[PDB]
Amino acid sequence: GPMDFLRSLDWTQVIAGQYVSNPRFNISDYFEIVRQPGDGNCFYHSIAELTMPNKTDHSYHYIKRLTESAARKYYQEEPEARLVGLSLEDYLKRMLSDNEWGSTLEASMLAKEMGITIIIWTVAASDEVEAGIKFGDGDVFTAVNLLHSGQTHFDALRILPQFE
Amino acid sequence: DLTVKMLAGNEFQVSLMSVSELKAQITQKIGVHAFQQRLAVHPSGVALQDRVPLASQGLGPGSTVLLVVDKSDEPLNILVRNNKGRSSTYEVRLTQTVAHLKQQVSGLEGVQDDLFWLTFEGKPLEDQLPLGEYGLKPLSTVFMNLRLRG
This structure's resolution (Å) is 2.3
With beta carbons under 8 A apart, name residues in chain A contacting B127. Answer: 82
Whether the CB of B81 is below 8 Å from some CB of chain A: the reply is: no
Q: In this complex, do A15 and B124 lie within 8 Å of one another by their Cβ atoms?
A: yes
Cis status, amide bond into B124, omega within 30 of 0: no
Measured at the CA of B110, the angle between CA B108 and CA B111, to 5 degrees, comes to 115
Closest by Cβ to A101, choosing from B115, B122, B150: B150
Mapping DSSP to helix (H, G, I), strand (E, B) and coil, where does residue A97 land? coil
Domain B72-150, classified CATH 3.10.20.90, yes or no: yes
Mapping DSSP to helix (H, G, I), strand (E, B) and coil, where does residue B23 land? helix
Q: A47, A60 in Cβ contact below 8 A?
A: yes
Region of residue B15 (left: phi > 0; alpha: psi -120 to 50; beta: else)? beta
Q: Which CATH fold would you assign to the domain A1-164? A: Cathepsin B; Chain A (3.90.70)
Reduced 3-state DSSP string for A44-59: HHHHHHHHCCCCCCCC
Domain B1-71, classified CATH 3.30.470.20, yes or no: no
State the Cα–Cα distance between residues A23 and A128, nearest whole angstrom: 10
Asked whether this chain's domains B1-71 and B72-150 adopt the same fold, the reply is yes
Query: Could you state, in order of their start, the residue ranges of all structural domains in chain B?
Result: 1-71, 72-150
Which residue blocks in chain B are alpha helix, DSSP H? 19-30, 98-109
A61 is catalytic: no
Task: Decide: residue B61, CB within 10 A, 0-12 exposed, 13-18 middle, 19+ buried.
Answer: exposed
What number of helices (H) and strands (E) belong to chain A?
A: 6, 7
